C-alpha cells in the first residue's frame, strides 16, 4: 500500500529461472510461444539482467519442454547472474554486439593444482573453436578438458564489456591464477535480499534515493523538489552500514562512500580536501549517491565540540550540503546510532531533513534475518528458526549474526575431541558430518546478551 | 566438554620422552614394534616437534628396552625440544634433507673460560668427522674433548634451517662467544604451561585465534566467518600481558605486538605511521596475530578524550580494523584492565566483538600458579603449597609472584648475619644451604595485600 515501490511487476520479459535441459554455458532455453512475443529469432545473442546489477550474455534457443514465462539456464549462468533457481530476470535483445579483438582470462587457483601442460590448448582452444560465443567481462565459466574441469574468469575484453569470440580473437591466458577466496567474497557481496525486517524502511530508501534519480520527471511533472539529505538512525547494529552496502551494489547511480572515523584519521586540512574531493567526484559523475557512515564522528555539535580543526569540518560539510545546485542530481545519505549528538544545523530544512529510523526488529523480522544468515550454513533438520525467532527478544541483526556464529562454534566444539589442534589436515569424513544441531542453537541462546 | 580443544589426542606418533640409553646427541631410541608402524627404517633422519614451536633433527635406531609409545633422547635433545622427561612429542619422517654447504657455530662464553688452542681441532672436527649428523639452526649441543666439555650454538646453516654435516661441509666457528644469559632468557620464554588457572579462557583463545588460522576450512565448510577481534580484560595483574607472551612464542602465526603506552610515546603522526606499519606488516605476512597491550592507552572514549592527535589515533585505528579484507587472515587481539573506558565504537560487531574475561583465580588456580612459580626455586620439604593456596584468597597471579619473591627475600634475610653486604664474594657453603622454608612463606603471607 505504501510498500508499493517494492512489489515488482508482471512484464513481457520477466521470466522465472528454471533448470537447464541443454547443458551449455552460452545457452538459454525459452518457450516458442514466448520467443515470438518478444520478437526473438533462434541463435540471437541476448542480454540478461540479474541481481546486484549483474549481467550475462547468451545465445537463445527454443525449448519445447519450457513454460512460456519460464527460462532455462545452467548453474554457470545462474552464477554470473547471481540468482538461485526460482528467481526472476530481465531478457533483452542485444543486437549490436561486436566481434572480439582480444580477451584476457585467468583460471581459479584451486582448480589448477596439478598439471599445467597447456591451458589454452587443452581447455580454451576447443571450448571456443568455431563456437562464436558471447562473453562479458567478469564472467566465471567452467571448461571440462578430458580428466579435469577448470573455472576461468574473464579479466578483460576488447571491446569492453562484451564481445563475440570469433576465430580472429586473440586469447591471452598468461598471469597469476585468480584466488578463490576473492571470488567467494565477490559472490557474497550484499544485495537488498540480504537485509531482513526492514521492508518498511527499504521502501522509504528506494522512495527517496532510487526513485528521484531513476525517474526525476515524476517530480518535475507534479512540480515538487525531491529531498537531498537522508539520515538513517537506529540503536547500534541494526544494519545501517549493512544497507550502505546493499545500496552501493544495488544502485543505478555513481556511489561514493565516506567513513567518518576514516575522515577523522587524516591530518588537519587533509580531511577537508577529501570532503570536497568526494562532493566534487559526485557532481562530476552525477546522478550520484554520497554515503556518510558514522556521521556523528564528523558532525558533533559545534557548540559542544572541543578541537578547532574539528569545528572546521562541520562548517566545511554544511557549506557543501548547501552548495549543491538543483540541477546537480545528488542525494546525500548518512547514518548514525547517536542522532541526538549531531549538530542540529545539519538537520535543518534542505540539509538532512528526512529521517529513516532503523529500529529493533519484531518477531517476524528476527525470523527473516535468521533465514538470511543461515542460507549458507550447514543446519540439521531438527532446527526450528521460528523457535529461535520467538526466543530472541530484543536482539537486533548483529545480535542474531553473533548467535549463529556462536552455535556454529558449539557445533565445531562437539568435534573437538575427535580432532587435535595440532594435526596438519582434518579427517575428511568428520568435515562432512559437521552441522549445526538445534541443541547447538539452544546453547548459543543460553549465552546471549543485550544489544 | 567445552575445554575439548585442549585435551590432545592419542596418535600414531605422539610418544612420551624417556631417558636415553644411547648417549649420543644425534640419536633417538624407539621400540621396533613402533618403528614399523610408522614405516621407519634404521638410520633414517627424522624431524621432531617439541613445545613453543621448537624443532629437533635426529637419526633413529631401535631399542629393545624401549616401550612402544615411548621414545629416548638425551638431555641435549630434551633441551632443543624444550621438554622435560615425561612430556610428549611429534615424530615425523624427514626424507628430503640436503647435504650441508656451510655451517657457522659459536661456543657459549661460560664454557670457554681458559685455553683456546683450537676449538675446531679439539672439539668440532672429531665430533663431526665421518658422522653425517643432522643439525638444525639454533640447536645447542655439547661436545667433550679430553679435559673439557663445551657447548656450541648453531648460528647459521646453508641450507637453512636443516642440513646433514658431511665431509664436504665447511665449518666456520670464528666470532664472539654466545652469552649464556641470552640463551637462558631463550629457554625461559613463556609457554602456555606457564599460565595458571585460566584453562577455560586459554580454551577460548585457541578457539578464536589459533583454530581459525590453523584450520580455516572448518568455518568455510560450515559456512560461517570467524571473528577477527578479541578483547581480553581483567582486574589488574591477571596475566593478560602474560598470555600475550605465551601466544607469541606458542603460535603458528606471524605475530606483531603493539604496546599502547609505547605507541603514545611517539611524536604526533609518528604513531599513525607505526599503526599502519603494523597492520601492513601483518597483512604482508598473513596469517597473522596483531596484539595490542594496554589498549585503553590508545583507545579512550573519543568523546571524553582531550587532545586532538589523541582522537585522531582512535579514528586511525578504527579505520584499520575496518580496512581488514576477508582474505586477509589476520586476528587482532588486545587487552585492558579497564574495559569500560575504551571507545565503544571499537566493540561494535566486526571489530573487537568477542571478549575473554581473565578474572581472579579460585583456590585451585592459585595452587596452579604457585606451582608454576616455584618450579625453579629452592624450597624446603616442609613447604605445603595447598596451604598457601587456601590462605591466599583474593590474590591474583601478580600477587602470588610477589608473595614468592617476598618469602625468598625473608629466606635470604635469615642468612644476613652470616653475611656482610661488604664482602667481595659469598661463602660458597651457605649459598648451597639457602632454601625457602614454609616459615618464610608464613612471613610473606603475613605481609600480603589486596590486588
Ligand atoms: N537488518 C539486518 N539484516 C541482516 N543482517 C543484519 C541486519 N542488521 C545487522 N545485521 C548483521 O550484523 C552486522 C553488523 O551490521 P551493521 O550494518 O554494521 O550495523 P550498524 O547498524 O551499522 O551498527 P552501528 O550503528 O555502526 S554500531 C552486519 O554485517 C550483518 O551481518
Ligand atoms: N595467570 C597467571 N599465571 C601465572 N603467572 C601469572 C598469572 N597472572 C600473572 N602472573 C605473574 O604476574 C606477572 C604480571 O602479569 P601480567 O600479565 O603483566 O599482568 P596483566 O594482567 O597484564 O596486568 P595489567 O592489566 O597490564 S596491570 C607475570 O609476569 C606473571 O609472572
Ligand atoms: Mg555502522
Ligand atoms: Mg599488562
UniProtKB/Swiss-Prot annotation, chains A, B:
The keyword Hydrolase applies. Changing residue 301 to A: Does not affect methylation by VCPKMT. Changing residue 172 to W: Severely reduced binding to DERL1. Changing residue 86 to E: In CMT2Y; increased ATPase activity. Its main location: cytoplasm. The modification N6,N6,N6-trimethyllysine is found at residue 304. GO terms for biological process: aggresome assembly; ATP metabolic process; autophagosome maturation; autophagy; cellular response to arsenite ion; cellular response to heat; cellular response to misfolded protein; cytoplasm protein quality control. It catalyses: ATP + H2O = ADP + phosphate + H(+). Changing residue 144 to S: In IBMPFD1; impaired autophagic function. Changing residue 358 to T: In IBMPFD1; uncertain significance. Its EC number is 3.6.4.6. ATP 1 binds at residues 236-242, 337, 373. The modification Phosphoserine is found at residues 2, 26, 451. It is found in: Cytoplasm, Cytosol; Endoplasmic reticulum; Nucleus; Cytoplasm, Stress granule. Changing residue 129 to D: Severely reduced binding to DERL1. Homohexamer. Forms a ring-shaped particle of 12.5 nm diameter, that displays 6-fold radial symmetry. Part of a ternary complex containing STX5A, NSFL1C and VCP. NSFL1C forms a homotrimer that binds to one end of a VCP homohexamer. The complex binds to membranes enriched in phosphatidylethanolamine-containing lipids and promotes Golgi membrane fusion. Binds to a heterodimer of NPLOC4 and UFD1, binding to this heterodimer inhibits Golgi-membrane fusion. Interaction with VCIP135 leads to dissociation of the complex via ATP hydrolysis by VCP. It is linked to Inclusion body myopathy with early-onset Paget disease with or without frontotemporal dementia 1: An autosomal dominant disease characterized by disabling muscle weakness clinically resembling to limb girdle muscular dystrophy, osteolytic bone lesions consistent with Paget disease, and premature frontotemporal dementia. Clinical features show incomplete penetrance. This is Transitional endoplasmic reticulum ATPase. The chain holds residues 12 to 462 of 806 of the full protein.
